Structures are given as C-alpha cells and as structure tokens.
Amino acid sequence: KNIIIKAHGQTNALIVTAAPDVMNDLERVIAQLDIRRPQVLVEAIIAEVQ
Amino acid sequence: GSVVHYEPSNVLLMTGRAAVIKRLLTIVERVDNAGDRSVVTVPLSWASAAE
C-alpha cells in the first residue's frame, strides 16, 4: 500500500514496516545518508585607527 | 450390454462382460493416473513476491 516509516527518538533508531522485498532501496539510501561530517574553524579580524 | 450411471458419491458401475472388465479397468486406471493435482513451491532469494 505505502511505506510507513516510524522513528523512535529515545534510542535514536528508526523502523521500516513497509515493503518486505525492496527494502534494499532503503538500505542503500540510508547507507548513503549516514556519514561523519567535517567542521570548519572561522575567525575574523578587524582593526582601525582614528 | 452394460449401462453407466452417476451418483454424487461418484460410484462408477457397470455390468458388461468379463473381458470388457479388463479393457475398462485399464482405461480408468490409465486416464485417472494422468497426473492429477499436486503441489510444490519455490523460495526466492531477493525479488518481490506479490509483484
């Protein structure tokens, strides 16, 4: 019928009670959607004279 | 000679002769033994079922 995705939030895990045959199209996409992310350090400087 | 009749209990009766018996027994035994209903399945590795 449809794909019903439910997310827990209290263990930070999600379910998939949807098609029992093409779930592979979900494992691939979540695997491409869970990835460590790099972070950047920003510093700015200003100066003047009067 | 013989006759043939049907009852909802699938009786199959005749009188005939005694040589006729051979030919007709052989008839039904061959034609009924022609591969009546049997069931078998197949699993499936990964593809969709209901589809």
Side-chain angles (χ1 to χ4, degrees):
Chain A
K1 296 180 183 177
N2 60 7
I3 294 167
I4 294 169
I5 296 168
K6 296 295 183 182
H8 188 197
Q10 291 83 13
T11 188
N12 188 1
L14 73 161
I15 294 169
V16 192
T17 67
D21 289 345
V22 60
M23 278 179 75
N24 297 312
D25 61 358
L26 296 175
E27 293 177 353
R28 293 182 186 176
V29 299
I30 61 93
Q32 292 178 356
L33 270 297
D34 190 358
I35 298 102
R36 296 179 67 252
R37 297 292 85 196
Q39 70 275 20
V40 63
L41 176 62
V42 170
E43 66 274 16
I45 59 95
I46 72 170
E48 64 186 358
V49 64
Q50 292 178 0
Chain B
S2 176
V3 300
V4 177
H5 298 286
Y6 63 89
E7 188 177 356
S9 65
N10 292 313
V11 68
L12 194 279
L13 61 89
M14 73 291 289
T15 180
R17 296 294 301 274
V20 179
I21 298 299
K22 298 291 180 67
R23 59 176 187 186
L24 276 299
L25 290 179
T26 302
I27 296 297
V28 299
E29 294 295 329
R30 182 64 60 80
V31 65
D32 190 356
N33 192 0
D36 293 331
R37 301 290 304 274
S38 67
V39 180
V40 68
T41 60
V42 59
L44 179 59
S45 295
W46 58 85
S48 178
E51 183 66 24

Coordinates of all heavy atoms in Angstrom, one line a residue:
Chain A
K1 N 0.8 -1.2 0.0 CA 0.0 0.0 0.0 C 0.9 1.2 0.0 O 0.8 2.0 -0.9 CB -0.9 0.0 1.2 CG -1.9 -1.1 1.2 CD -2.7 -1.1 2.5 CE -3.7 -2.2 2.6 NZ -4.5 -2.1 3.9
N2 N 1.7 1.4 1.0 CA 2.5 2.5 1.3 C 3.7 2.1 2.1 O 3.8 0.9 2.5 CB 1.7 3.6 1.9 CG 1.1 3.3 3.3 OD1 1.4 2.2 3.8 ND2 0.3 4.1 3.9
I3 N 4.6 3.0 2.4 CA 5.7 2.7 3.3 C 5.5 3.6 4.5 O 5.5 4.9 4.4 CB 7.0 3.0 2.6 CG1 7.2 2.0 1.4 CG2 8.2 3.1 3.5 CD1 8.3 2.4 0.5
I4 N 5.4 3.0 5.6 CA 5.2 3.8 6.9 C 6.5 3.7 7.6 O 6.9 2.7 8.1 CB 4.1 3.2 7.7 CG1 2.7 3.4 7.1 CG2 4.0 3.8 9.1 CD1 1.6 2.6 7.7
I5 N 7.2 4.9 7.7 CA 8.4 5.0 8.5 C 8.1 5.6 9.8 O 7.4 6.6 9.9 CB 9.5 5.8 7.7 CG1 9.8 5.0 6.4 CG2 10.7 6.0 8.6 CD1 10.6 5.7 5.5
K6 N 8.6 4.9 10.8 CA 8.5 5.4 12.2 C 9.9 5.6 12.8 O 10.8 4.8 12.5 CB 7.7 4.4 13.0 CG 6.3 4.2 12.6 CD 5.5 5.5 12.8 CE 4.1 5.2 12.3 NZ 3.2 6.4 12.5
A7 N 10.0 6.7 13.6 CA 11.3 6.9 14.2 C 11.1 6.9 15.7 O 10.1 7.4 16.3 CB 11.9 8.3 13.8
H8 N 12.1 6.4 16.4 CA 11.9 6.2 17.9 C 12.2 7.5 18.6 O 11.4 8.1 19.3 CB 12.7 5.1 18.4 CG 12.4 4.8 19.8 ND1 13.2 4.0 20.7 CD2 11.2 5.0 20.5 CE1 12.6 3.9 21.8 NE2 11.4 4.4 21.8
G9 N 13.5 8.0 18.5 CA 13.9 9.2 19.2 C 14.4 8.9 20.6 O 15.2 9.8 21.2
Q10 N 14.1 7.8 21.3 CA 14.5 7.6 22.6 C 15.7 6.6 22.7 O 16.4 6.6 23.7 CB 13.4 7.1 23.5 CG 12.3 8.2 23.8 CD 11.3 8.3 22.6 OE1 11.3 7.4 21.8 NE2 10.5 9.3 22.6
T11 N 15.9 5.8 21.7 CA 17.1 5.1 21.4 C 17.8 5.7 20.1 O 18.9 5.2 19.8 CB 17.0 3.6 21.2 OG1 18.3 3.0 21.1 CG2 16.3 3.4 19.9
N12 N 17.2 6.7 19.5 CA 17.7 7.2 18.2 C 17.8 6.1 17.2 O 18.9 5.9 16.6 CB 19.0 8.0 18.4 CG 19.4 8.7 17.2 OD1 18.7 8.6 16.1 ND2 20.6 9.3 17.2
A13 N 16.8 5.3 17.0 CA 16.7 4.4 15.9 C 15.3 4.4 15.3 O 14.4 4.9 15.9 CB 17.0 2.9 16.4
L14 N 15.3 4.0 14.0 CA 14.1 4.2 13.2 C 13.7 2.8 12.6 O 14.5 1.9 12.5 CB 14.3 5.1 12.0 CG 15.2 4.7 10.9 CD1 14.8 5.5 9.7 CD2 16.6 4.9 11.2
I15 N 12.4 2.7 12.3 CA 11.9 1.4 11.8 C 11.5 1.6 10.3 O 11.4 2.7 9.8 CB 10.7 0.9 12.6 CG1 11.1 0.5 14.0 CG2 10.0 -0.2 11.9 CD1 10.0 0.3 15.0
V16 N 11.2 0.4 9.7 CA 10.7 0.3 8.3 C 9.8 -0.9 8.4 O 10.2 -2.0 8.5 CB 11.9 0.1 7.4 CG1 11.4 0.3 5.9 CG2 13.0 1.0 7.7
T17 N 8.5 -0.6 8.3 CA 7.5 -1.6 8.3 C 6.8 -1.3 6.9 O 5.7 -0.7 6.9 CB 6.4 -1.5 9.4 OG1 5.7 -0.3 9.3 CG2 7.2 -1.5 10.7
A18 N 7.4 -1.6 5.9 CA 6.9 -1.3 4.6 C 7.2 -2.5 3.7 O 7.4 -3.6 4.3 CB 7.6 0.0 3.9
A19 N 7.3 -2.3 2.4 CA 7.6 -3.4 1.6 C 8.8 -4.4 2.0 O 9.9 -4.0 2.2 CB 8.0 -3.0 0.2
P20 N 8.4 -5.7 2.1 CA 9.4 -6.7 2.5 C 10.2 -7.3 1.4 O 10.8 -8.3 1.6 CB 8.5 -7.8 3.2 CG 7.2 -7.6 2.4 CD 7.1 -6.2 2.2
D21 N 10.3 -6.6 0.3 CA 11.1 -7.0 -0.9 C 11.9 -6.0 -1.5 O 12.8 -6.3 -2.3 CB 10.1 -7.6 -2.0 CG 9.5 -8.9 -1.6 OD1 10.0 -9.5 -0.6 OD2 8.5 -9.3 -2.2
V22 N 11.7 -4.7 -1.3 CA 12.6 -3.8 -2.0 C 13.3 -2.9 -1.0 O 13.9 -1.9 -1.3 CB 11.7 -2.9 -2.9 CG1 10.7 -2.0 -2.1 CG2 12.7 -1.9 -3.7
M23 N 13.2 -3.3 0.3 CA 13.9 -2.6 1.4 C 15.3 -2.3 1.0 O 15.9 -1.3 1.5 CB 13.9 -3.4 2.6 CG 12.6 -3.4 3.4 SD 12.6 -4.4 4.9 CE 13.7 -3.4 6.0
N24 N 15.9 -3.1 0.1 CA 17.3 -2.8 -0.4 C 17.4 -1.4 -0.9 O 18.5 -0.8 -0.8 CB 17.7 -3.8 -1.4 CG 17.7 -5.2 -0.9 OD1 18.2 -5.5 0.2 ND2 17.0 -6.2 -1.6
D25 N 16.4 -0.9 -1.5 CA 16.4 0.5 -2.0 C 16.4 1.5 -0.8 O 16.5 2.7 -1.1 CB 15.1 0.7 -2.8 CG 13.8 0.5 -2.0 OD1 13.9 0.1 -0.8 OD2 12.7 0.7 -2.6
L26 N 16.2 1.0 0.4 CA 16.3 1.8 1.6 C 17.6 1.6 2.3 O 18.2 2.6 2.7 CB 15.2 1.5 2.5 CG 13.8 1.9 1.9 CD1 12.7 1.5 2.8 CD2 13.8 3.4 1.6
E27 N 18.0 0.4 2.4 CA 19.4 0.2 3.0 C 20.4 1.0 2.2 O 21.3 1.6 2.7 CB 19.8 -1.3 3.0 CG 18.9 -2.0 4.0 CD 19.2 -3.5 4.1 OE1 19.9 -4.0 3.2 OE2 18.6 -4.2 4.9
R28 N 20.3 1.0 0.8 CA 21.3 1.7 0.1 C 21.2 3.2 0.4 O 22.2 3.9 0.5 CB 21.2 1.5 -1.4 CG 21.5 0.1 -1.8 CD 21.4 0.1 -3.3 NE 21.6 -1.3 -3.9 CZ 21.5 -1.6 -5.2 NH1 21.3 -0.6 -6.0 NH2 21.6 -2.8 -5.6
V29 N 20.0 3.7 0.5 CA 19.9 5.2 0.6 C 20.3 5.6 2.0 O 21.0 6.6 2.1 CB 18.5 5.7 0.1 CG1 18.3 5.3 -1.3 CG2 17.5 5.1 1.0
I30 N 19.9 4.9 3.0 CA 20.3 5.3 4.3 C 21.8 5.2 4.5 O 22.5 6.0 5.0 CB 19.6 4.5 5.4 CG1 19.8 3.1 5.3 CG2 18.1 4.9 5.4 CD1 20.9 2.5 6.1
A31 N 22.4 4.1 3.9 CA 23.9 4.0 3.9 C 24.5 5.1 3.2 O 25.6 5.6 3.6 CB 24.2 2.7 3.2
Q32 N 23.9 5.7 2.1 CA 24.4 6.9 1.6 C 24.0 8.1 2.4 O 24.3 9.3 2.0 CB 24.0 7.0 0.1 CG 24.7 6.1 -0.7 CD 24.2 6.2 -2.2 OE1 23.3 7.0 -2.4 NE2 24.9 5.5 -3.1
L33 N 23.2 8.0 3.4 CA 22.8 9.1 4.2 C 23.3 9.2 5.6 O 22.8 10.1 6.4 CB 21.2 9.2 4.2 CG 20.6 10.0 3.0 CD1 21.0 11.4 3.1 CD2 20.9 9.5 1.6
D34 N 24.1 8.2 6.1 CA 24.7 8.3 7.4 C 26.2 8.4 7.3 O 26.9 7.4 7.0 CB 24.3 7.1 8.2 CG 24.7 7.2 9.6 OD1 25.3 8.2 10.0 OD2 24.3 6.2 10.4
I35 N 26.8 9.6 7.5 CA 28.2 9.9 7.2 C 28.7 10.9 8.1 O 28.1 11.9 8.4 CB 28.3 10.3 5.7 CG1 27.9 9.3 4.7 CG2 29.8 10.6 5.5 CD1 26.5 9.5 4.1
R36 N 29.9 10.6 8.7 CA 30.6 11.6 9.5 C 30.7 12.9 8.8 O 31.0 13.0 7.6 CB 32.0 11.1 9.9 CG 32.1 9.9 10.7 CD 33.6 9.6 10.9 NE 34.2 10.6 11.8 CZ 35.1 11.5 11.3 NH1 35.5 11.5 10.0 NH2 35.6 12.4 12.2
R37 N 30.6 14.0 9.5 CA 30.7 15.3 8.9 C 31.8 16.2 9.4 O 31.9 16.4 10.6 CB 29.4 16.1 9.0 CG 28.4 15.2 8.2 CD 28.7 15.3 6.7 NE 29.7 14.3 6.3 CZ 30.4 14.2 5.2 NH1 30.1 15.2 4.3 NH2 31.2 13.3 4.9
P38 N 32.7 16.7 8.6 CA 33.7 17.6 9.0 C 33.2 19.0 9.3 O 32.2 19.5 8.8 CB 34.6 17.7 7.7 CG 33.7 17.4 6.6 CD 32.6 16.5 7.1
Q39 N 33.9 19.7 10.2 CA 33.6 21.0 10.7 C 34.7 22.0 10.5 O 35.9 21.6 10.5 CB 33.1 20.9 12.1 CG 34.2 20.6 13.1 CD 34.5 19.1 13.2 OE1 34.1 18.4 12.3 NE2 35.1 18.7 14.2
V40 N 34.4 23.3 10.4 CA 35.3 24.3 9.9 C 35.5 25.3 11.0 O 34.5 25.7 11.7 CB 34.9 24.9 8.6 CG1 33.6 25.6 8.8 CG2 35.9 25.9 8.1
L41 N 36.7 25.9 11.2 CA 37.0 26.9 12.1 C 37.1 28.3 11.5 O 37.9 28.4 10.6 CB 38.3 26.6 12.8 CG 39.0 27.5 13.9 CD1 38.1 27.8 15.1 CD2 40.3 27.0 14.2
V42 N 36.2 29.2 11.9 CA 36.2 30.5 11.3 C 36.7 31.5 12.3 O 36.2 31.5 13.5 CB 34.7 30.8 10.8 CG1 34.6 32.3 10.5 CG2 34.3 30.0 9.7
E43 N 37.6 32.4 11.9 CA 38.0 33.5 12.7 C 38.1 34.8 11.8 O 38.6 34.7 10.6 CB 39.3 33.3 13.4 CG 40.5 33.1 12.4 CD 40.6 31.7 12.0 OE1 39.6 30.9 12.1 OE2 41.7 31.3 11.4
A44 N 37.6 35.9 12.3 CA 37.7 37.1 11.5 C 38.4 38.1 12.4 O 38.4 38.0 13.7 CB 36.3 37.7 11.1
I45 N 39.0 39.1 11.8 CA 39.8 40.1 12.5 C 39.4 41.5 12.0 O 39.1 41.6 10.8 CB 41.3 39.8 12.3 CG1 41.7 39.8 10.8 CG2 41.6 38.5 12.9 CD1 42.2 41.1 10.4
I46 N 39.5 42.5 12.8 CA 39.2 43.8 12.4 C 40.2 44.8 13.1 O 40.6 44.5 14.2 CB 37.8 44.3 12.7 CG1 37.7 44.5 14.2 CG2 36.8 43.3 12.3 CD1 36.4 45.1 14.5
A47 N 40.5 45.9 12.5 CA 41.3 46.9 13.2 C 41.2 48.2 12.4 O 40.9 48.2 11.2 CB 42.7 46.4 13.2
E48 N 41.3 49.3 13.2 CA 41.2 50.6 12.6 C 42.0 51.5 13.4 O 42.6 51.2 14.5 CB 39.8 51.1 12.6 CG 39.2 51.2 13.9 CD 37.8 51.5 13.9 OE1 37.2 51.7 12.8 OE2 37.1 51.6 15.0
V49 N 42.1 52.8 13.0 CA 42.8 53.8 13.7 C 41.9 55.1 13.5 O 41.3 55.3 12.5 CB 44.3 54.0 13.3 CG1 44.3 54.5 11.8 CG2 45.0 55.0 14.2
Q50 N 41.9 55.9 14.5 CA 41.2 57.2 14.5 C 42.1 58.3 15.0 O 42.6 58.2 16.2 CB 39.9 57.1 15.3 CG 38.8 56.2 14.8 CD 37.6 56.3 15.8 OE1 37.7 57.0 16.8 NE2 36.6 55.5 15.5
Chain B
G1 N -26.2 -55.2 -23.3 CA -25.0 -55.0 -22.6 C -25.1 -53.9 -21.4 O -26.2 -53.5 -21.1
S2 N -24.0 -53.6 -20.8 CA -23.9 -52.8 -19.6 C -24.5 -51.4 -19.8 O -24.9 -51.0 -20.9 CB -22.5 -52.6 -19.1 OG -22.5 -51.8 -18.0
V3 N -24.6 -50.7 -18.7 CA -25.0 -49.3 -18.6 C -24.1 -48.6 -17.7 O -23.2 -49.2 -17.1 CB -26.5 -49.1 -18.1 CG1 -27.4 -49.9 -19.1 CG2 -26.6 -49.7 -16.7
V4 N -24.2 -47.3 -17.6 CA -23.3 -46.4 -16.8 C -24.1 -45.3 -16.2 O -24.9 -44.6 -16.8 CB -22.2 -45.8 -17.7 CG1 -21.3 -44.9 -16.9 CG2 -21.4 -46.9 -18.3
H5 N -23.9 -45.2 -14.8 CA -24.7 -44.2 -14.1 C -23.8 -43.5 -13.1 O -22.7 -44.0 -12.7 CB -25.9 -44.8 -13.5 CG -26.8 -45.4 -14.4 ND1 -27.6 -44.6 -15.2 CD2 -27.1 -46.7 -14.8 CE1 -28.4 -45.4 -16.0 NE2 -28.1 -46.6 -15.8
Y6 N -24.3 -42.3 -12.7 CA -23.6 -41.4 -11.8 C -24.4 -41.2 -10.6 O -25.6 -40.9 -10.6 CB -23.3 -40.0 -12.5 CG -24.6 -39.4 -12.7 CD1 -25.2 -38.6 -11.8 CD2 -25.3 -39.6 -13.9 CE1 -26.4 -38.0 -12.0 CE2 -26.5 -39.0 -14.2 CZ -27.1 -38.2 -13.2 OH -28.3 -37.6 -13.4
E7 N -23.7 -41.3 -9.4 CA -24.2 -40.9 -8.1 C -23.3 -39.9 -7.5 O -22.1 -39.9 -7.7 CB -24.4 -42.2 -7.2 CG -25.1 -42.0 -5.9 CD -25.1 -43.4 -5.2 OE1 -24.7 -44.4 -5.8 OE2 -25.6 -43.4 -4.0
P8 N -23.9 -38.9 -6.7 CA -23.0 -37.9 -6.2 C -21.9 -38.4 -5.3 O -21.0 -37.7 -4.9 CB -23.9 -37.0 -5.4 CG -25.1 -37.9 -5.0 CD -25.2 -38.8 -6.2
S9 N -22.0 -39.7 -5.0 CA -20.8 -40.4 -4.4 C -19.9 -41.0 -5.4 O -19.0 -41.7 -5.0 CB -21.4 -41.5 -3.4 OG -22.0 -42.5 -4.2
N10 N -20.0 -40.6 -6.6 CA -19.0 -41.0 -7.7 C -18.9 -42.5 -7.9 O -17.8 -42.9 -8.3 CB -17.7 -40.4 -7.5 CG -17.8 -38.9 -7.6 OD1 -18.3 -38.5 -8.6 ND2 -17.3 -38.2 -6.6
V11 N -19.9 -43.2 -7.5 CA -19.9 -44.6 -7.9 C -19.8 -44.7 -9.4 O -20.3 -43.8 -10.1 CB -21.2 -45.3 -7.4 CG1 -22.4 -44.8 -8.2 CG2 -21.1 -46.7 -7.5
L12 N -19.0 -45.7 -9.8 CA -18.9 -45.9 -11.3 C -19.1 -47.4 -11.4 O -18.3 -48.2 -11.1 CB -17.6 -45.4 -11.8 CG -17.5 -45.3 -13.3 CD1 -17.1 -46.6 -13.9 CD2 -18.8 -44.8 -13.9
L13 N -20.3 -47.8 -12.0 CA -20.7 -49.1 -12.0 C -21.0 -49.5 -13.5 O -21.4 -48.7 -14.3 CB -22.0 -49.3 -11.2 CG -23.2 -48.5 -11.6 CD1 -24.1 -49.2 -12.6 CD2 -24.0 -48.2 -10.3
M14 N -20.9 -50.8 -13.7 CA -21.3 -51.4 -15.0 C -21.5 -52.9 -14.8 O -21.1 -53.5 -13.8 CB -20.3 -51.1 -16.1 CG -19.1 -51.9 -15.9 SD -18.2 -51.3 -14.4 CE -17.7 -49.7 -15.0
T15 N -22.1 -53.5 -15.8 CA -22.2 -55.0 -15.8 C -21.4 -55.6 -16.9 O -20.5 -56.4 -16.7 CB -23.6 -55.5 -15.7 OG1 -23.6 -56.9 -15.7 CG2 -24.5 -54.9 -16.9
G16 N -21.8 -55.3 -18.2 CA -21.0 -55.7 -19.3 C -20.7 -57.2 -19.4 O -21.6 -58.1 -19.2
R17 N -19.5 -57.6 -19.8 CA -18.9 -58.9 -19.8 C -17.7 -59.0 -18.9 O -17.4 -58.0 -18.3 CB -18.6 -59.3 -21.3 CG -19.8 -59.3 -22.2 CD -20.7 -60.4 -21.8 NE -20.0 -61.7 -21.8 CZ -19.9 -62.4 -23.0 NH1 -20.5 -62.0 -24.1 NH2 -19.2 -63.5 -23.0
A18 N -17.0 -60.1 -18.9 CA -15.9 -60.2 -18.1 C -14.6 -59.8 -18.8 O -13.6 -59.4 -18.1 CB -15.7 -61.6 -17.5
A19 N -14.6 -59.9 -20.1 CA -13.5 -59.4 -20.9 C -13.5 -57.9 -20.9 O -12.4 -57.3 -20.8 CB -13.5 -60.0 -22.3
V20 N -14.6 -57.3 -21.1 CA -14.8 -55.9 -21.1 C -14.2 -55.3 -19.8 O -13.6 -54.2 -19.8 CB -16.3 -55.5 -21.1 CG1 -16.5 -54.1 -21.0 CG2 -16.9 -56.1 -22.3
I21 N -14.2 -56.0 -18.7 CA -13.7 -55.6 -17.4 C -12.2 -55.2 -17.6 O -11.8 -54.1 -17.2 CB -13.9 -56.6 -16.3 CG1 -15.4 -56.8 -16.2 CG2 -13.3 -56.1 -15.1 CD1 -16.1 -55.6 -15.7
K22 N -11.4 -56.0 -18.2 CA -10.0 -55.8 -18.5 C -9.8 -54.4 -19.2 O -9.1 -53.5 -18.7 CB -9.4 -56.9 -19.3 CG -9.4 -58.2 -18.6 CD -8.4 -58.2 -17.4 CE -8.5 -59.6 -16.7 NZ -7.9 -60.7 -17.6
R23 N -10.5 -54.3 -20.3 CA -10.3 -53.1 -21.1 C -10.7 -51.8 -20.3 O -9.9 -50.8 -20.4 CB -11.0 -53.2 -22.5 CG -12.5 -53.4 -22.3 CD -13.2 -53.4 -23.7 NE -14.7 -53.4 -23.5 CZ -15.6 -53.6 -24.5 NH1 -15.1 -53.7 -25.8 NH2 -16.9 -53.6 -24.3
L24 N -11.8 -51.9 -19.6 CA -12.2 -50.6 -18.9 C -11.5 -50.3 -17.7 O -11.1 -49.1 -17.5 CB -13.7 -50.7 -18.6 CG -14.7 -50.3 -19.8 CD1 -14.4 -48.9 -20.2 CD2 -14.6 -51.2 -20.9
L25 N -11.3 -51.3 -16.8 CA -10.3 -51.1 -15.7 C -9.0 -50.4 -16.2 O -8.6 -49.4 -15.6 CB -10.0 -52.4 -15.0 CG -11.0 -53.2 -14.2 CD1 -10.4 -54.5 -13.7 CD2 -11.5 -52.4 -13.0
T26 N -8.5 -51.0 -17.2 CA -7.3 -50.4 -17.8 C -7.5 -49.0 -18.3 O -6.6 -48.1 -18.1 CB -6.8 -51.3 -19.0 OG1 -6.5 -52.6 -18.5 CG2 -5.4 -50.7 -19.5
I27 N -8.7 -48.7 -18.8 CA -9.0 -47.4 -19.2 C -8.9 -46.4 -18.1 O -8.0 -45.5 -18.1 CB -10.4 -47.3 -19.9 CG1 -10.5 -48.1 -21.1 CG2 -10.6 -45.8 -20.3 CD1 -9.5 -47.7 -22.2
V28 N -9.7 -46.6 -17.0 CA -9.7 -45.6 -16.0 C -8.4 -45.5 -15.3 O -7.9 -44.4 -15.0 CB -10.9 -45.9 -15.0 CG1 -12.2 -45.8 -15.7 CG2 -10.8 -47.3 -14.4
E29 N -7.8 -46.7 -15.0 CA -6.5 -46.7 -14.3 C -5.5 -46.0 -15.1 O -4.5 -45.4 -14.5 CB -6.0 -48.1 -14.1 CG -6.9 -48.8 -13.1 CD -6.8 -48.2 -11.7 OE1 -5.7 -47.7 -11.3 OE2 -7.8 -48.2 -10.9
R30 N -5.6 -45.9 -16.4 CA -4.6 -45.1 -17.1 C -5.0 -43.6 -17.1 O -4.2 -42.7 -16.8 CB -4.4 -45.5 -18.5 CG -3.3 -44.7 -19.3 CD -2.0 -44.8 -18.6 NE -1.5 -46.2 -18.6 CZ -0.9 -46.8 -19.6 NH1 -0.8 -46.2 -20.8 NH2 -0.5 -48.1 -19.5
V31 N -6.3 -43.3 -17.4 CA -6.7 -41.9 -17.6 C -6.8 -41.2 -16.2 O -6.6 -40.0 -16.2 CB -8.1 -41.9 -18.3 CG1 -9.2 -42.5 -17.5 CG2 -8.4 -40.5 -18.6
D32 N -7.1 -41.9 -15.2 CA -7.2 -41.3 -13.9 C -5.7 -41.1 -13.3 O -5.5 -40.0 -12.7 CB -8.0 -42.1 -12.9 CG -8.2 -41.4 -11.6 OD1 -7.7 -40.2 -11.4 OD2 -8.9 -41.9 -10.7
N33 N -4.8 -41.9 -13.7 CA -3.4 -41.8 -13.2 C -2.7 -40.8 -14.1 O -1.5 -40.8 -14.0 CB -2.8 -43.2 -13.3 CG -1.4 -43.3 -12.6 OD1 -0.9 -42.3 -12.1 ND2 -0.8 -44.5 -12.7
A34 N -3.4 -40.0 -14.8 CA -2.7 -39.0 -15.7 C -2.6 -37.7 -14.8 O -3.3 -36.7 -14.9 CB -3.5 -38.7 -16.9
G35 N -1.6 -37.8 -13.9 CA -1.0 -36.6 -13.3 C -2.0 -35.6 -12.7 O -1.9 -34.4 -13.0
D36 N -2.9 -36.0 -11.8 CA -3.8 -35.2 -11.1 C -3.1 -34.2 -10.2 O -1.8 -34.3 -10.0 CB -4.8 -36.0 -10.4 CG -5.7 -36.7 -11.4 OD1 -5.9 -36.2 -12.5 OD2 -6.2 -37.8 -11.0
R37 N -3.8 -33.3 -9.6 CA -3.3 -32.2 -8.8 C -2.2 -32.6 -7.8 O -2.3 -33.6 -7.1 CB -4.4 -31.6 -8.0 CG -5.6 -31.1 -8.9 CD -5.1 -29.9 -9.7 NE -4.6 -28.8 -8.8 CZ -5.4 -27.9 -8.2 NH1 -6.7 -27.9 -8.5 NH2 -4.9 -27.0 -7.4
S38 N -1.1 -31.9 -7.9 CA 0.0 -32.0 -6.9 C 0.6 -30.6 -6.7 O 0.5 -29.8 -7.7 CB 1.1 -33.0 -7.4 OG 1.8 -32.5 -8.5
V39 N 1.1 -30.4 -5.5 CA 1.5 -29.0 -5.1 C 3.0 -29.0 -4.9 O 3.6 -30.0 -4.4 CB 0.8 -28.6 -3.9 CG1 1.2 -27.2 -3.4 CG2 -0.7 -28.6 -4.1
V40 N 3.6 -27.9 -5.2 CA 5.1 -27.7 -4.9 C 5.3 -26.2 -4.9 O 4.5 -25.4 -5.5 CB 5.9 -28.4 -5.9 CG1 5.8 -27.8 -7.2 CG2 7.4 -28.4 -5.4
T41 N 6.4 -25.7 -4.2 CA 6.7 -24.3 -4.1 C 8.1 -24.0 -4.6 O 8.8 -24.9 -4.9 CB 6.5 -23.9 -2.6 OG1 7.5 -24.7 -1.8 CG2 5.2 -24.2 -2.1
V42 N 8.4 -22.8 -4.5 CA 9.8 -22.3 -4.8 C 10.1 -21.1 -3.9 O 9.3 -20.2 -3.8 CB 10.0 -22.0 -6.2 CG1 9.1 -20.9 -6.7 CG2 11.5 -21.6 -6.5
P43 N 11.1 -21.1 -3.1 CA 11.5 -19.9 -2.4 C 12.0 -18.9 -3.3 O 12.1 -19.1 -4.6 CB 12.6 -20.4 -1.4 CG 13.1 -21.6 -2.1 CD 12.0 -22.2 -2.8
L44 N 12.5 -17.8 -2.8 CA 13.0 -16.7 -3.7 C 14.1 -15.9 -2.9 O 13.8 -15.5 -1.8 CB 11.9 -15.8 -4.1 CG 12.4 -14.7 -5.0 CD1 13.1 -15.4 -6.1 CD2 11.3 -13.9 -5.6
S45 N 15.2 -15.7 -3.5 CA 16.3 -15.0 -2.8 C 16.0 -13.6 -2.4 O 16.0 -13.3 -1.3 CB 17.6 -15.1 -3.7 OG 18.1 -16.4 -3.9
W46 N 15.8 -12.7 -3.4 CA 15.6 -11.3 -3.1 C 14.5 -10.6 -3.7 O 14.0 -9.6 -3.2 CB 16.9 -10.5 -3.4 CG 17.3 -10.6 -4.8 CD1 16.8 -9.9 -5.8 CD2 18.2 -11.5 -5.3 NE1 17.4 -10.3 -7.0 CE2 18.3 -11.3 -6.7 CE3 19.0 -12.5 -4.8 CZ2 19.1 -12.0 -7.5 CZ3 19.8 -13.3 -5.6 CH2 19.9 -13.0 -7.0
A47 N 14.0 -11.0 -4.9 CA 13.0 -10.3 -5.6 C 11.6 -10.2 -4.8 O 11.4 -10.9 -3.9 CB 12.7 -10.9 -7.0
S48 N 10.8 -9.3 -5.3 CA 9.5 -9.1 -4.7 C 8.6 -10.3 -5.0 O 8.7 -11.0 -6.0 CB 8.8 -7.9 -5.4 OG 7.5 -7.7 -4.9
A49 N 7.7 -10.6 -4.0 CA 6.8 -11.7 -4.1 C 5.5 -11.4 -4.8 O 5.2 -11.7 -5.9 CB 6.6 -12.4 -2.7
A50 N 4.6 -10.6 -4.0 CA 3.3 -10.3 -4.6 C 3.4 -9.6 -5.9 O 2.4 -9.7 -6.7 CB 2.6 -9.4 -3.5
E51 N 4.5 -9.1 -6.3 CA 4.6 -8.3 -7.5 C 4.7 -9.3 -8.7 O 4.2 -9.1 -9.8 CB 5.9 -7.4 -7.5 CG 6.0 -6.6 -8.7 CD 5.0 -5.6 -8.9 OE1 4.3 -5.2 -7.9 OE2 4.7 -5.1 -10.1

